[PDB]
Amino acid sequence: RQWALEDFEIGRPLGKGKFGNVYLAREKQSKFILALKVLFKAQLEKAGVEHQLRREVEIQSHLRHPNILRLYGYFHDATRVYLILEYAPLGTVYRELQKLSKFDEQRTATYITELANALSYCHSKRVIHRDIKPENLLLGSAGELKIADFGWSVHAPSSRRTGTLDYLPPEMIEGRMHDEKVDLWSLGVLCYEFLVGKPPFEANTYQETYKRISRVEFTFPDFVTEGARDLISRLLKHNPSQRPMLREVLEHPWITANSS
Template identity: 75%
Template sequence: MDPVRRLNNNALTGPTMQAAGVGPRRVPVAPTRVAAAALPVPRPLVPANGPQRVQKQKYEIKADLRKPPSHQPSSQAVVAKENVKSKPAVSEIHVAQVPSKSSDPSSQNAPDYISEDNKSSEKKRWTLDNFDIGRPLGKGKFGNVYLARERQSKFILALKVLFKCQIEKAGVEHQLRREVEIQAHLRHPNILRLYGYFHDAARVYLILEYAPKGELYSELQKCVRFDDQRSATVRKRVWVQYITELSDALLYCHSRGVIHRDIKPENLLLDGTGQLKIADFGWSVHAPSSRRTTLCGTLDYLPPEMIEGRMHDEKVDLWSLGVLCYEFLVGKPPFETTTHDETYRKISKVEFTFPPFTSEGSRDLISKLLKHNPKERLPLNQVLVHPWILANSTKQPTFMHEKDSVQPVPESSAKQ
């Protein structure tokens, strides 16, 4: 049987995915160079009328790594025609069995030759033949993510498949390079590991840590909000745990000269034990060259200095942390409106209110993070010891006492 037909015979159809809750989906803001100009109202990047979030649509994904996402029909599986001739450039995909529920993939330790924590000067050169490909985990603009298993060790991981033609068409090669070079240097329990990467003529493959519980956004949609009442104590402590883990991971990133710039629930994953993992470092930059005016990230989470086209630094992540805290408590971002112009205005004026069910402690923390002047925002080390955090958190930060051993990420990792 030729490789193309065998590929399609081995393809698995992923489960139909639907939004876990009600509410429109965020629309990412495209990268745009904004000049610092004295304008009363910043110019929106997209039409002013329309929701800032769009509802997730149902879709199915076939484990067909040959074609870019734009060539794959969304309403039906991709089926190869009988008269299509095989192409020798296509690698054969072997489908892995889905791990059983009794074995938690996230509890496994990656072998040294995968994690590259060994001191050997020789690094393994990966190819697609090193992996069994399983069900799809997600679908993105430039490719898909699949559950995978490394054949030699049987180690379960995630394989992110990106199509070069799509990346080049969008002009985001530098973003991908930045994501790989930065994330590969980071070692923190709350940062998703990038074990390695490889590529062929048509695709780039990122070998990533597998987070079985998926996006934090899905968890957020399950609860419209939670009260600071006794009946919601457990839920509140879970959110505070996420805030603690995120703050600790960001403190680690900033100490190594890395700014994320796109913190939002969609970029935060959960492993099998419910531990938070920061993912998607495509918008990250290295601090020595981070006084920038690039407008990036998601509109609801953008700080005033970015939408106003002013220079910004690592304190943009403090603003995003404050927006995330608010959304955990209330169920929606503090500056969410029906139009982009109005959202821009509210962010620039730092115009938001707290519902009556929020506590004084949570209001104090959020208000100290959502400051128009970046220099006035509460530092991450003070976030971790804020009274409201200490009163509700059961987890100690892992990084606060390890600063002496910190080594900066090489500046060449994020020049762009």
């Protein structure tokens, strides 16, 4: 509907982005509360990621799922690009993890189910998210998980190169061809991080994390249950073909026993 910045009242920042900031905003006519993801043209140009910004917009604007953050539209002016997003009022899963330290098995299994459903819908459109991480997982008014930040989203298969490597699978880390299986690896990383409080390949340096991912070198603390170990171990397979389908994740006995 060719919006312009004059149509919105701007509130506090909601979060910092790589190419700008996200602000709380209210559309003047309807009083609709939303989030405005503001990006600087000069920064996007310098990075040469314009084309990828259009992909974020095109991919996310066509997705309709209760566990996927909505993108209502976008517009731009002389210096900025504005993405009109659904406001997630309970913030990030990242912040929830920082304050709780770790999630219990029931909260974890529920989040994994919500993610697996959203990803099943994405993959059915051959959409690869590729940036599944707690800061990109938002919470709706009922505490339901919403996949956000389609910034690095692509259509499968892809041989396209892109923060930390913590959530990236070996094939992406090595600049090789990849498909929807990249999001299955990220799901395994998230399951571990939710239960343990940190991702399994976390390290001080990018170099050390790269080596850990390449080797699939990780251990579980003693408190991690057999069922949780089984699902994570199945997801974190160096070989993308060996990673289970999302149908298998949703039907996993540990998921069905602790969700939702």
